Curated annotation (Swiss-Prot), chains B, D, E:
Reactions mediated catalytically: (2R)-2-phosphoglycerate = phosphoenolpyruvate + H2O
SMART domains, per database record: Enolase_C (SM01192), Enolase_N (SM01193)
Family assignment from sequence similarity: Belongs to the enolase family.
EC class name: lyase
Residues engaged in binding Mg(2+): D242, E291, D318
The protein's Enzyme Commission number: 4.2.1.11
Organism of this sequence: Streptococcus thermophilus (strain ATCC BAA-491 / LMD-9)
Single GO molecular function: magnesium ion binding
InterPro entries: Enolase, Enolase-like_C_sf, Enolase-like_N, Enolase_C, Enolase_CS, Enolase_N
Protein name (database record): Enolase
UniProt subcellular location: Cytoplasm; Secreted; Cell surface
Active site positions, chain numbering: E205 (proton donor), K343 (proton acceptor)
Pathway: Carbohydrate degradation; glycolysis; pyruvate from D-glyceraldehyde 3-phosphate: step 4/5
Cross-referenced PROSITE patterns: ENOLASE
Length: 130, 434, 105, 434, 434
């Protein structure tokens, strides 16, 4: 049983980012600067999955996972004496780590990178800031 | 040295067992002041409102922890660092910090407690009496008291529409003698009621609430008590009324319905019928004061009452004005009433209280410093009355310490003043001719 | 802050320049706000009442702070930090050889 | 600096309209103390008597100008020059200057006023709270209050022979909570009496005196009010009684005639039947206190009552001991009662009050600091109860500032004590087993 | 100016030459207080333990550098900044800082030294006597001394099982006369021992430890010396015993074996036999106090002894209660003993010492403030005894200034109190009857 399939990842990203925490004014707490490194690493992993075999990209996925955990744990936004952690909220509401656990070949890796594409696309669609 | 270093509120109990708050102010040199707030009303359209908790679990929703928190966390940060003698600056800073006309955010009780505590701490620092600090060097007039002696209306089961009946010992030479006369009349009335078989226990202000036949019977028994004490009604001791006609006024019919308190068969009186009813009461009995004889919204009736009886009888607007500068200005413009009842927590600040007193005095009106139904051991209103040279006070009966505290403070003020102290009596009713 | 205390000259200056009568208030982002909105935010919990206001400015470059004193074991007075200031000369420095360097007059 | 410079007395009014006196003490450094005297009794076999003028033309013979002159012209010339911290020396000097066992020459009211004023001035000079000055550094125990709630006997027209009823909130965690519980039960009882049509006006102590059917009716209504407020009788709030059996005791027939208050059908009991009635009341209701259960001169009855009920209920001697060291010692010798009601003006000075408290504590008795019928805005008995760590106070109901002032002072003392403040509740009844 | 700014500790010597620690406290204004700690025990299941170095090369492992370092480096940083008059707050803060029921981390000796130094600095700051600061204005009772005259048990080689014998001059008019009587009886007994050829050198407590024949011979010699000085035994001077029955109690056989100290043919007595022996001794001699007459864990024997001899003989529990609040609760509940020996270093805090004293007083027990085997020149226990009005002290014999210091402190206190000072004498045994 996989959480990401070719028939649901775009709608999954839709629902995942429509549930992200918002300020009292309605703006998203997440910004593109907080996830810029993760997006760059996902883009590079997608680029390198086309040429090289999956066994060569065994350290890149692990680096991507440790980057996801580090960024989710370190990014904090404080408004109105309340501190939220938008990257961790995005990771748990998008099931990023669980999807990363189901990466075992080129197909699943490319599906995950397309899922991240969809996540940031729809984040920008609903008023996400740079 | 005089810089405020600590402002701290705590929740205490008022005279009815309901919560209120007290504020303590400490300055740098160790001067200390404590202000206790009387219990007012938390809801009001054009009056200052007190902040209540509303938590039904604690004190029936009447806790004052929110106002205490507002003092400790909001007012304390702003006020600490001010000079303790900067009463007007502190009061204006609190008014600006609240930001609302009705003082509903901070709570009027919070602001009043801080104001009184600051004034008392400044008087302590200067080592001067509180009336000297508040009113300057020319503070000498001892107020004439309106001693509430009989209760009716919504405070009694008796068929009497009028809320309060009072004795005014305006014929006494000194305030000490006036207090003695009032105590003796109070005890003579107690004996008369015990002989008559009526209820003797006291109410909120210390006055009796017997089962009389009506208003006339209550005034006659008050006069009998005065004569039993050995004083001449109309020369030594006079009668005042607090009708509180807003309680039994039908707004939609524009008629003062006396049937609310005097049974189904009571006479139902319109505006002019109320006017000449009050005139008949004034002619029959030695009445010097009538308070709230018209509804708070019957401006034409108030103007007709002032035209008819304003030259010889003091007409006090309690609910008519509600210690509001705008309403008092309007009443002065339209020649409505000739006296205002001043309640400190209805406006919530000492500066605004003194502004209202000064505005009333400038128009020929008399300002009557008044007590609330739920009082404390704090007797600042006595110092306010002496400081303003108002010449009239209304602080209750001769029974409970919530009322006796102000009389004791006035006795202390008279003793301190010595030969300078003046009790004017009838001359303190300067709003009346002759 | 225990080694030093507020100087009496600065306290007198602040007292009768009335700088505490002209406080400025800030929200949680450190932006100037009116006292009404500051009170409203503090009551609502959106502003910490402690670190959100300023006591104007005192003029004249006065020393704000003076050394604090304590009692030594024989009952004499002594500055708090004078005697525990240091114990070792920190070793140091390093003399870097830079003879090849064109200086500017 | 601490040398007493000025001692001045004046006449003020108590919480009944009757005169009393207050004394002000000034030292050389400006330390100020004020002591007001509660009104007591000028007639007593071995209790200290207060000095009244007896002039029927002034206050009905209750003026206190004689005691005021005694302070101003006799005590002041003797005490001025003493150190203000010499409370024991000043009190001994005043007792010697009186030279009379019941303090009739100078008046016990004058001596008590000077004692309280000197103690408060000494506390003001040392900049310590009054309880710290009076009791030392280890003052932490907030008293358990017996809040009077229902009246009878000579204070009511109802057929209840017992003088008054009390609620004891001994299950509260703090004194603040105990005060809130008492206030809520008071308001619940007021609502219940309103539903039943009974009277709502308060008496001298602040408590209701409705027209109940009998003692059991009043106790059951108290239990109903406790349960309506949301508290468990017997675990959170207990019931105490002041029978004041000396009122309805027939000295010649050696019987307790309830017919004096409960009508012609009341039961005339002997000492044994009275003890049986008290025991069955204790077994029927959660009663933890009985005050004046027997007559002040029925020593055999007191001994039998202590043998029967003294293990599980507190037996307080109010008229039995009249705050007397000789009587208290005699009772300790014969195992009569296990508590004494400490009235500060029944003995005369603070030194003698503290001696009586410490003797009772040493004998295993509990000392209950008590109010008088005529009280003032003075709240020194709260500081006495906290200073001695007595653990019990009887300062009236929740309806008048003469009583609420002591409760507010206890709230203030608890607030200053902070984390070291102790409310023991049931553990304050150390005269009982388990 | 009352804020604690400096806390220093240093290692000094006690009366036996073993190390102890002393603490000094300086406030901001320069108020100074020094507290010296008596030598206690670092072992015990339910007692506060002192902290020792354990370095066998220094003082045989009895150094106190660890506790001094704890005061200088741990306690001082926590306590500096407190108000010096916040004794309860300081003591609670130090108890929390230790975090251990028996104060084993910081050391009970360190905590007691800081407590005493803080109390003395606060008394110096307020410019009041130490007993006035500790016990308030009502501090007048000069304690009755039970002073050691003859030793035995483990402090002597004579065949006497009982540890201590004391004289109690309870018939003296003043404390000065009682001290003179004790010193004269001490010298007369010295003369009698010199005539008999026995030894004269004094032990740790200052009393003689001669080679008598038994308990009866020792008490007979004490009575002979009392009569030689010129005082009536049983009227002027009484005898007291410190059996220390734990030292010769066999736990396995549940028997009191006198063979440990009294030889080989010594009687072996059960609990009932021990009670009979003590009752026979009380009937034979004017013995008024017996201390540790049973084992520290023999609760049934203690209860039976209090049943038999508790009405006429004061029974003190030293090892029985170990001045522990919980053991005192259990003893009061179980009717075991009627007096507690109060040692301030077995608790480690003045606040808890005073708590134990008033708790014992509330039960009818007497608190006897006691010294330790290794004392100092500090005489705070005398001020404690006067402050609590305990009326009993046990501070040693008349031959070393580790005891004469406390006796001189009591002489100074009696001189300062003047006419107020009271020596109750035989009345100070309020735990007895009649």
């Amino acid at each position: 049983m996989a959480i990401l399939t070719d028939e649901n990842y775009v709608d999954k990203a839709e629902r995942a980012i429509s549930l992200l925490e918002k300020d009292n004014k309605g703006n998203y707490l997440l910004t593109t600067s907080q996830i810029r490194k993760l997006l760059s690493l996902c883009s590079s992993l997608y680029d390198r999955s086309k040429e090289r075999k999956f066994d060569e990209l065994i350290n890149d996925v692990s680096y991507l996972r440790v980057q996801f955990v580090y960024q989710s744990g370190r990014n904090s936004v404080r408004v109105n004496r309340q501190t939220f952690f938008p990257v961790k909220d995005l990771v748990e509401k998008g099931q990023i780590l669980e999807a990363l656990k189901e990466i075992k070949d080129r197909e699943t890796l490319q599906r995950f990178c397309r899922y991240m594409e969809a996540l940031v696309a729809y984040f920008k669609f609903y008023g996400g800031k740079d | 040295m005089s810089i405020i270093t600590d402002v701290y509120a705590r929740e205490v109990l008022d005279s009815r067992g309901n919560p209120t708050l007290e504020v303590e102010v400490y300055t740098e040199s160790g001067a200390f002041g404590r202000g206790m707030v009387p219990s007012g009303a938390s809801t009001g359209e054009h009056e200052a409102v007190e902040l209540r908790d509303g938590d039904k679990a604690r004190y029936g929703g009447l806790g004052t922890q929110k106002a205490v928190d507002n003092v400790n966390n909001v007012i304390a940060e702003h006020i600490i660092g001010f000079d303790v003698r900067d009463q007007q600056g502190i009061d204006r800073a609190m008014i600006a910090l609240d930001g609302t006309p009705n003082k509903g955010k901070l709570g009027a009780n919070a602001i009043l407690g801080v104001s009184i505590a600051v004034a008392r701490a400044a008087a302590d620092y200067l080592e001067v009496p509180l009336y000297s600090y508040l009113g300057g060097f020319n503070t000498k007039v001892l107020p004439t008291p309106m001693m509430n002696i009989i209760n009716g209306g919504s405070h009694s089961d008796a068929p009497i529409a009028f809320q309060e009946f009072m004795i005014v010992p305006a014929g006494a030479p000194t305030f000490k003698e006036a207090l003695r006369w009032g105590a003796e009349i109070f005890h003579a009335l107690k004996k008369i009621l015990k002989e008559r078989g009526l209820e003797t226990a006291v109410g909120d202000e210390g006055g009796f609430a017997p089962r009389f036949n009506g208003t006339e019977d209550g005034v006659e028994t008050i006069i009998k008590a005065i004569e039993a004490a050995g004083y001449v009604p109309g020369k030594d001791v006079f009668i005042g009324l607090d009708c509180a006609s807003s309680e039994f006024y039908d707004a939609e019919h524009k008629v003062y319905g006396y049937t609310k308190f005097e049974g189904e068969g009571a006479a139902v009186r319109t505006a002019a019928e109320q006017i000449d009813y009050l005139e008949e009461l004034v002619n029959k009995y030695p009445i010097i004061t009538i308070e709230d004889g018209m509804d708070e919204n019957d401006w034409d009736g108030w103007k007709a009452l002032t035209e008819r009886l304003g030259g010889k009888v003091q007409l006090v607007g309690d609910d008519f004005f509600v210690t509001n500068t705008a309403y008092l200005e309007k009443g002065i413009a339209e020649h409505a009433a000739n006296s205002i009842l001043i309640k400190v927590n209805q406006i919530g600040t000492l500066t605004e209280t003194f502004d209202a007193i000064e505005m009333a005095k400038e128009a020929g009106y008399t300002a009557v410093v008044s007590h609330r139904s739920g009082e404390t051991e704090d007797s600042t209103i006595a110092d306010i009355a002496v400081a303003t040279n108002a010449g009239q006070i209304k602080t209750g009966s001769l029974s409970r310490t919530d009322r006796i505290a102000k009389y004791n403070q006035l006795l202390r003020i008279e003793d301190q003043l010595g030969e300078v102290a003046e009790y004017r009596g009838l001359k303190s009713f300067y709003n009346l001719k002759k | 802050m225990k080694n030093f205390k507020i100087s009496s000259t600065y306290r007198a200056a602040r007292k009768q320049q009335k700088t505490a009568n002209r406080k400025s208030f800030y929200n949680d982002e450190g932006y100037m706000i009116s006292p009404s909105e500051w009170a409203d935010g503090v009551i609502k919990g959106l502003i910490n009442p402690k670190n959100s206001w300023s006591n104007d400015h005192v003029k004249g470059y006065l020393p704000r702070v003076s050394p604090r004193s304590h009692w030594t074991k024989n009952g004499y007075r002594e500055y708090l930090g004078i005697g525990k200031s240091r114990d070792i000369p920190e070793k140091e420095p390093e003399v870097i050889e830079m003879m090849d360097l064109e200086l500017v007059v």
